[PDB]
Subunit: 88 residues, 3 copies
Amino acid sequence: QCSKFIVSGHVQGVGFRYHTSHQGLKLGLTGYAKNLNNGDVEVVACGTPERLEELYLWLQEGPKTASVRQVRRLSSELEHDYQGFEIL
Amino acid sequence: CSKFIVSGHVQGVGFRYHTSHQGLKLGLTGYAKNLNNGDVEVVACGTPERLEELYLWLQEGPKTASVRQVRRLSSELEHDYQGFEIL
Amino acid sequence: QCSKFIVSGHVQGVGFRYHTSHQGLKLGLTGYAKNLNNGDVEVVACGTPERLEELYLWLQEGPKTASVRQVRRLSSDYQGFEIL
Ligand code: MOO
Ligand code: MOO
Ligand code: MOO
């Protein structure tokens, strides 16, 4: 039920983890946005494939402060349990 | 305070959070609650004009949920809440 | 940098601190939106000069419930963007 995404660009320190968690919550998703050591943001989100598809669209095109260069889709077959959408 | 019963595809789709967010942005207090039948019950406290704005939002604001119908229940409840709860 | 904005108008009890803090967090800012005894709201924000200009733009013209009359630019690590 979870898909992981790797987001690159000017994406740290620009409200991206916060806004991502907000959008995820508005979509009824659970999961996290995490700063990675290399400057990217890792997003894991859990729910329906359609919801995850909208989230992936938003990550690419949604109004946001960050400047997204690439949104890479990793596994879509992750089996995780999250209570909310945490910033990590 | 007013009470609204929202029916449709409204659970598991971020409706209570999005509602709480719209309420807080309007300075309203109250709650969005999942009902066992699949409805969501919304109580909001504020000026009549702000509660109408929440009503417009419930009906037509861009959201994930598919709202079938927004039922206007009582509008003269006298409650006190601190924030806007997701219940 | 940090900046302080004294916002006046119908700005209390109208979701102004919540929305302002939401807007700051979406911008990557830290600081607070504080109700003042006199009815003003005092917004302090810390981040890049560019991101602070974006907050100011929002305070003055951003869609919101509050009816802002004036936004005072004044001089000024916070964790998050606190309501009060
Ligand atoms: O600058 Mo953030 O990505 O909400 O911690
Ligand atoms: O998918 Mo929700 O935002 O607790 O109703
Ligand atoms: O309704 Mo407000 O966002 O506590 O200043």
